[PDB]
Amino acid sequence: ARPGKTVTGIAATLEREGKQVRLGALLWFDSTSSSVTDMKRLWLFSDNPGQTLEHWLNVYHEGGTRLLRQMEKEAIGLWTYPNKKQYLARLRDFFEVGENAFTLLNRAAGLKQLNSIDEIFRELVLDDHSAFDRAAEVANSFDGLTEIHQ
Amino acid sequence: SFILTRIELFNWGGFHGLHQAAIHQDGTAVIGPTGSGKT
Amino acid sequence: MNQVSGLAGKESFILTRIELFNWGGFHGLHQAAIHQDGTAVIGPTGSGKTTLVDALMTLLLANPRYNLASTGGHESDRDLISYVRGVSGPSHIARPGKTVTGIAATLEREGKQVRLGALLWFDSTSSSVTDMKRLWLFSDNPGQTLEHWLNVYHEGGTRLLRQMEKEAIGLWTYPNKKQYLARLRDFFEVGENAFTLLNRAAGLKQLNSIDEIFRELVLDDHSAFDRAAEVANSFDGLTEIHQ
Amino acid sequence: SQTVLQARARSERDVRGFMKTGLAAEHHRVGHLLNEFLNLALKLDWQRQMIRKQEVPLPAVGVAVTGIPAIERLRFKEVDDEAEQTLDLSNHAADLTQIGDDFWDAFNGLDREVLIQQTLQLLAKENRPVGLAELAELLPPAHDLETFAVWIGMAREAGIEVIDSQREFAELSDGEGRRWRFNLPTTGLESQALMDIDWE
Amino acid sequence: TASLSYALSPAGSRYPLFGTIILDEAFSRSSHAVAGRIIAALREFGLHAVFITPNKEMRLLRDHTRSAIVVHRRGQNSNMASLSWEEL
Amino acid sequence: LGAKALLDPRFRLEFAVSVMDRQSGNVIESRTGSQGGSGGEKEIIASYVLTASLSYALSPAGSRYPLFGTIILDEAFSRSSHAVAGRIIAALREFGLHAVFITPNKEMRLLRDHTRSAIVVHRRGQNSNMASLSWEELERHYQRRGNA
Amino acid sequence: IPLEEAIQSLSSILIEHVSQEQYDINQDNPFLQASRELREWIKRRLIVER
Ligand SMILES: Nc1ncnc2c1ncn2[C@@H]1O[C@H](COP(=O)(O)OP(=O)(O)O)[C@@H](O)[C@H]1O
Ligand SMILES: Nc1ncnc2c1ncn2[C@@H]1O[C@H](COP(=O)(O)OP(=O)(O)O)[C@@H](O)[C@H]1O
What we know:
This is part of a larger assembly, with five copies of chain A and two copies of chain D. Chain A is α+β, with helices and mostly antiparallel strands. Chain A has six helices and five strands. In chain A, helix 1 crosses helix 2. The radius of gyration of chain A is 22 Å and the shape is extended. By secondary structure, chain D is mainly α. In chain D, 44% of the residues lie in helices and 10% in strands. Chain D has helices at residues 2-19, 25-42, 49-52, 101-107, 112-126, 132-138, 144-157, 191-195, and strands at residues 162-173, 179-187. In chain D, a hairpin with a 5-residue loop joins strand 1 (162-173) and strand 2. The chains are: A alpha+beta, D mainly alpha. The interface between D and E is medium-sized, with 30 and 25 residues. One adenosine-5'-diphosphate sits between chains B (13-14, 34-39) and F (104, 123, 128).
């Protein structure tokens, strides 16, 4: 539908006892190029109710990214993260939960395979701290020492 | 606890122009024909 | 719409009947009559509908994909021995000792009835496949029924059932499953691959792309990994000689 | 303690690196030279900025000439890219009527709580077994087959006896008037066995 | 459905010699219209069909079928019942 | 399997689930070794345990209440009956979770029984439009359609 | 602490101490201040990151 120059928007919102929180994003292409790195991103985080995806898109069309970060600085209760890791760090700080929480939420959101229980745990429930690479490193060190001995 | 009631969504998926969801904090469902934009 | 269903019966044997005895949760005797035009099966979840479906596929294939609907291509939790043992998920075994389980189905093409059968029994309390004793029945005789076969088995061992087949017209029986399956395939003039595809359909579920549809659901692989292994071993012998 | 083991393995790495030095002649000469140079390097004051960025007399090899400044290689911004896209912030609202009839029919599905309440009340007032046909006549179902299933469901849930071989029939008109004839199992719904069971 | 119908038809037969097809969880992941089209395709292939459902899409099955089998379980025991309907 | 059993911690353990008597240590249930293959019970068990775990992860330490109450779910309800689906909704609410249920136009009745609002989505070719409603407005629109 | 999480939490903490006017208060960008302080404390060998 939008192969050429375009702008895309997303904005969720939640509240607890009459206080707003709003997760935002913007994704626009300056041309038809559609490679992953070509995607120009600008994440947004704001609790000020006046902020809306409509307002962000209006500001974008009026100016651009240069104006957007200026809007964040001039604005209050708003933030902008030109990268995602910082954005998600902020979000995890606000909700005071580790990344494992969100990742498990997403894993559960589409759980349809829904197989025997043992697979539910190992796959979805439990964070991963396997020890394959470390065993490989131990073997490497032992082989090097054996090389010295030989 | 915070409860999600909104989705302002623009030029995303099969959603041209602006769209808006109003999920309800009291318990909600979202429904549409196969291939309608739920997922 | 359903008028074409009768045309299918003219063109083909359509299956509408079931006789059961102590299969899974279906303890004692139970039976079902089915409409030629098509049918449905219903009930609360975890009540025995997929158990009945598996009951059907046990008669038709050497090995089905038990409860393939639940798994989605993954290994079945159940099998013939569990169903005949009345497993319920860990008293959880309804039939621990020497017991019997009978299952059968009926069909019709142009008014001509054909009934398949399977008399199962443990003569032991152990639940191994070896302890899993069985007899399979193919019938062009309408008068032969799962109740009759159950009664004959109650009279005595398999020798009474085979003797009954010899005495009975239009009946065949096979204490070896593959003979029964070969008889069924010969009757229907189609290879077992059709029944394997039917079983895949019995638990038809998700996939990820059009290519996967063909590759998994449609076709049979017969990949040549064994050929590669033997080729590699023979070439290793050749390498020995060359060295 | 794992952290220490990492350092020990790291050190064994360099031990292994220095074990293999049975160099060829030219390799051996350059190895002597490089070890001498590196020893000389340690004594420099690396932390200082100016030490690091001092030039060295190493000769230029692999030299590449580039960026020949021909004026004819110049090209200029072209403004044909100005094709504008409208900001369509309008609300692309929905149209409820366009939704298929099947959606509404599912939206009309059989409600089990109301059906349970009504059936229990009817059977309580009737204070006797009531077959499925009798219930259909006494209570015109909306989703006829849905209510048949749910009625047999309560029957089995209460353990009420059922015989499937002996039969009985009940006729009903559907939502569009077309009439149907059912074949049904003989049984009698008894109220007392039903109220004693919880339903959801 | 196409592959199964084609496989079940002996050599040169435009229609199967075994027309029954089983579908457990018939339409657990589909809408009403899609399931209707599925049954229409089955009609195109002239196959007798069996659908299983934990009380979903009763509208479609009632519109498209002519009989039902009831499944219920009390404790470790289960039993069935037979039901049918026809158009007058 | 052996490599994971050795170097992957969790595979060193077999996970089992059971159903406990509220008032006592009495236990009759076990989902381990032999899953039972129940076509409805496995689904409810998995969804329940997943909801509990997800709530625990979502709740900042100390608090028994998740801070991000929203959860997303799907046709696990379709695999579930009406009663077990109601059990699912009850458990989800009890763990402090507000939820959003997606389904392709079916199992309406129990949703209406145990949910307040709904959203409808359209497909009009290569386009989709969606509106938010309360159950009662949808019911009134159904009545309008039924009249004509 | 993962560095991004650490710096975000630090920028949150420093904001609490803007009330402590008696020592430096960042007038315009607390996040920059937190990043600078993490750099500085790495420079003093107070915190080593790997
Ligand atoms: N890769 C895709 N395949 C099919 N449809 C897609 C795809 N990408 C976007 N779409 C658009 O977005 C929608 C995605 O399908 P969707 O209806 O959300 O799945 P579901 O039926 O499970 O809810 C489609 O209706 C379509 O308009
Ligand atoms: N052969 C069996 N093996 C293991 N568990 C069984 C077996 N038969 C019945 N059960 C139990 O009895 C019920 C059978 O219902 P079932 O048809 O298998 O599930 P569904 O209707 O969802 O497909 C299940 O709740 C299951 O726990």
